[PDB]
Amino acid sequence: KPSVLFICTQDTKEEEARFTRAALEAAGVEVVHLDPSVRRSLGGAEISPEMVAQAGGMTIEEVRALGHEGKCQDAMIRGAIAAAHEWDARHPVSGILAVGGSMGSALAGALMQSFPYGLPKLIVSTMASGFTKPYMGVKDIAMMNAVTDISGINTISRDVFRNAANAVAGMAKGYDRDKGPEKPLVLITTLGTTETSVKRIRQALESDGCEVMVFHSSGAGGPTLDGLAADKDVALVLDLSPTEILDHLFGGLADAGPDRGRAALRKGIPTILAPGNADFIIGGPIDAAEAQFPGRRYHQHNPQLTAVRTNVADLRKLADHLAANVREAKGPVRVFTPLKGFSSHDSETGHLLDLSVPGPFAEYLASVMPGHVPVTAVDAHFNDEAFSSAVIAAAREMLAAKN
Amino acid sequence: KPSVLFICTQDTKEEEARFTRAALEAAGVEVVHLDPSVRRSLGGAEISPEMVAQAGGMTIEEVRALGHEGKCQDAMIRGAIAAAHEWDARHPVSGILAVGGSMGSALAGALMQSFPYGLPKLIVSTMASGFTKPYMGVKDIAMMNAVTDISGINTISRDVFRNAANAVAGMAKGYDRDKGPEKPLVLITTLGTTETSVKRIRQALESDGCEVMVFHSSGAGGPTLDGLAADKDVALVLDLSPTEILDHLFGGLADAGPDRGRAALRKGIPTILAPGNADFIIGGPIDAAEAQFPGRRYHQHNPQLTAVRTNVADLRKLADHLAANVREAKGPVRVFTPLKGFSSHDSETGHLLDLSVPGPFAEYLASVMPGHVPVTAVDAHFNDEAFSSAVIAAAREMLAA
Ligand SMILES: COc1cc(C(C)=O)ccc1O
Ligand SMILES: COc1cc(C(C)=O)ccc1O
Ligand code: NA
């Protein structure tokens, strides 16, 4: 029998998970239930909430002690993705089914984007608003809504759950993981403010036959890349947005701890580094951000998040940290850095342009990197075709290397 | 074996269509391929493009010569829906799978919205924008997207098509159309400018246990309601937006011919009429709309569509036509009309407001409707809670009768 990874929190409405798991089993698959609940642990799940938390580096006690709703969701996203790949590496699944509200669907979307293209993936959403919007697109994720007003406002339809179980079971029984052409797996980090070049890079390498995954470097994406680099078969890492490292260095909101970006280097995966988004630290709401980082220029991204302009002194600490990471690398590394700005905020159309910073940064980064890691300073903005073209050419050389 | 209705244009996706059909067959279903192609008519489709066109009342050559995105789409939607329900009438399907771009996905969505809640439904879209947006919400339609750039930009993936076929076959093999309680079926017409009250009406009757289908009355929706009313077990029709009748009278863009709105009445289904959106005729872009409909007032709804303000005389013609239709009714009919405006364009925060029209229109409408059909003039706007509540109360009485 094929195995389906089933993602569903039991702390709310435990009958949804019970019903859907029974419908999967009745349709002829085995179930591995991953339960990322924070409020209560009901039992009956292969991957318990406690296991989920710890896979991400926190005990559930520590997760429950977070006083920040965003950081708490990030911890369970990080844990769920870590636990799912740690499991799949040893016991491969043939499909992923998720049932959740706004937060649970968002967690499932991120997790599903980190599994291979073509693996069956289905989210059953239970919020009245639209489907979740996974980062940079739905990709191959199938979506169904279970909310109906028939028989009562905001009924959660068991007919949808039954249809979803029968669908995923059908897909899983038809799925042949070791089929089709093998596609080298390329992992990329980005923020919205570096998507222009990241999209060009993605499209070029996919055109070559690679499978490219793109992760949002806002607190959980970088850790997803790091987990894949350690536990799955990755051909190339393009760690182009070190937001989570820079925020770690200065107390920003994307802090994901000190080991961000080290895994690929320790595994010896060919890696390209770039300083996308190094023009800002991510602070909180404007009044808090200004209080935490006085005397700077700010851009209010949304009500919760403020881009805080960096300076040369800030980026020398980033350079030092990246150089130390690279000195631990067990495989090849290249570094590319743009001379005319790091993101769309740091641009002629943005609110944080400061052209005095890229030059000194590039010169210092080259001085601290070891001799076997060349730094290429590109006379372009990050989002210029000249910069994506330079990264693409380098990626293609690293992917052409023979065993 | 159960059957799956498979919607896919072969004139642009022939390889994908044959692959996906084969995958459905391998997974143990029979396939009914409905092919709404507009360029070519390739072999193997149960419901050919020619049938899609003619089931709606046009030859495929006539559809091709429209040259016009909206008129072509409306023709193929009307035809695809008529042909699909005609097939299903005698040979019932157990699921619907569609594979298409922007237009094919939208046609599939409209067709799926005219089939019962819970019947397996999956749209695989092939446009880069992602999923299509079915009118007033996805409800029970499942969505996938097959675009990928791997091995070539704007590829569409065999892995996704195979997953989609396996999914719908699995759902169809597990589907029991007789499971659960019967839901009384209620059909409603609307435009975006009457959605505020229609949403309340839908929610109240769904919460009573009804299945409610809602149709956009822009050229294909009304005809879908009429087809269902003629041929299916319908508990109640709320024909609250006679746009397609008004545009037939004046040559507007939602014209769907002379029989719009008659089927439910001729059959005898309990029906409520209202004059939602009677503040405007639908014209084309503003310059052409002014030339077609001179001497009026206009509101540019989007670059393609202009709302052309109606006047007293126009609405007396509409009332005459509605009354003629009602005199043919074989079952209960009631009428509700709002005294403070017919749509969100005809409101204090709308660009077509004319509060001098609803009062005299309501008087005239009552005078030409037969006396056994009540005509209630509500001292509210169409989209006010008082108006939806009046319609809901009458709907409940008519369902209980
Ligand atoms: C959290 O993700 C983002 C934050 C910013 C800021 C804070 O400007 C920009 C782009 C992003 O994708
Ligand atoms: C074609 O559908 C619509 C047209 C209008 C106009 C022409 O104002 C308003 C709402 C609609 O849902
Ligand atoms: Na949940």
Ligand code: NA
């Ligand atoms: Na549950």
Ligand code: NA
């Ligand atoms: Na939930």
